[PDB]
Structure formats: structure tokens, C-alpha cells
Amino acid sequence: HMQVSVETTQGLGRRVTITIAADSIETAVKSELVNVAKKVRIDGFRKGKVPMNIVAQRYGASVRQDVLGDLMSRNFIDAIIKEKINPAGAPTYVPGEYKLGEDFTYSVEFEVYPEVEL
RNA sequence: GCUCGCCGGAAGACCAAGGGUUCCUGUCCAACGUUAAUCGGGGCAGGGUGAGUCGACCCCUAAGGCGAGGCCGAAAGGCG
């Protein structure tokens, strides 16, 4: 579910907002670390036999902010080729209002493609 | 993995002495291994030795060691 909300500041400029669902983002926090919990070389443990308590209490949630950048542009496969609003390549990437286990709201800024004299 | 061979009062399993991480897991192959090595009792990194009742310490003494005073000896020191 996308729920695109688009407002225009003035003319050529444009702001696009992405609202990913509340329970859909942080349900794969487990699904993004079980492919790296079996790869981390913590001192006192074997190769990939680290219990869930130690890895989660150190950076088990501190790597989701790097996946939050991947989920910042994950919805653009359902926003650029399915909703057809064309930005100017790579716009700004500004994080916005995020709550505790809840919805994600932010906005970008660019200019639209001007017309051509064909 | 399947055959073949060898020891079986030992070439098996433990303990004391002595050694002091050689134990286990991941990784590396320059040097070390009488050859090559991906392997090792090798290099590097992390783990691993849980005791009222097993041993030490402890109580008691043998050979013997030391020995308050003491006797003896130029000094050191000897015997007790």
C-alpha cells in the first residue's frame, strides 16, 4: 500500500511524500538481521552461533536505519513507473516524522522536467 | 566410503613424575615437518580447566634438617 500524497510549492517545483504502512516496516527487522547474524564475528562465539540477545542489544536495530535508506527508495518502484511522477534524477533525501513502530512520513524537493520545442 | 594389512600383557585404556596451552573451534601455508600439503603438536585470533566428601593445604611422625639457652672452636663456624 502506497498512499501517495503530492503537493506543489510553486510552479516548477514539486514535493513528493511517501507513507509506508505502520506494521509493514518493522516486521522485517528480524528478516534483515538473520542474514547478517550468521555472518558477524563476535569474539566469544563461533561462526554464526551468536544468540539473539547479544546481537539485538548492540546493533540489532541500529542497522535498520541503513535499510531505512533502502526503504526510502523502495516505494519508488511503486511511485515512478506505476504512478508516473518524474523527478529530476536524484532529489534530496530528507528524513521526516517517524514514530515508535508506526508510519513513516517525509518529503523531497526537486524540479520537474520542462517542456521541449519539438 | 569400501576392501586390504598390522599390534592386542599393547603399537589399547588410565594415574604419579615431568612438561606448561601442546586441548577445542575458525583461518592462513612464507618459515618449521628430512618431499608436495588444502593437513599438523606450525603462524594468528577467539574460546576451554566449576568440588563439604578426589588431591594439596591441614593434624601426626621416620631417616634426617635446623635448633632458645648450652658445651666447644684464632674469626667464619662444629655438635646438640
Q: Where are the alpha helices (DSSP H) in chain A?
A: 22-25, 29-33, 52-59, 64-70
Method: cryo-EM
Q: How far is the CA of A19 from the C1' of B6 (A)?
A: 77
- Nearest Cα to A108, choosing from A100, A99, A96? A96
> How many CB atoms sit inside 10 A of residue A75's CB?
19
Nearest nucleotide over every DNA/RNA strand to the A47 CA, judged by C1': B26
* Cα separation, A69 vs A32, whole angstroms: 13
Q: How far is the CA of A42 from the C1' of B57 (A)?
A: 41
Q: How far is the CA of A36 from the C1' of B17 (A)?
A: 51
Q: Please say whether the dihedral angle defined by the alpha carbons of residues A29, A34, A40 and A44, taken in this order, is positive or negative.
A: positive
Residue in the structure block whose three cell numbers are 558477524: A40
Helix, strand or coil, per DSSP, at residue A106: strand
Amino acid identity of residue A59, one-letter, is Y
Nearest nucleotide over every DNA/RNA strand to the A43 CA, judged by C1': B46
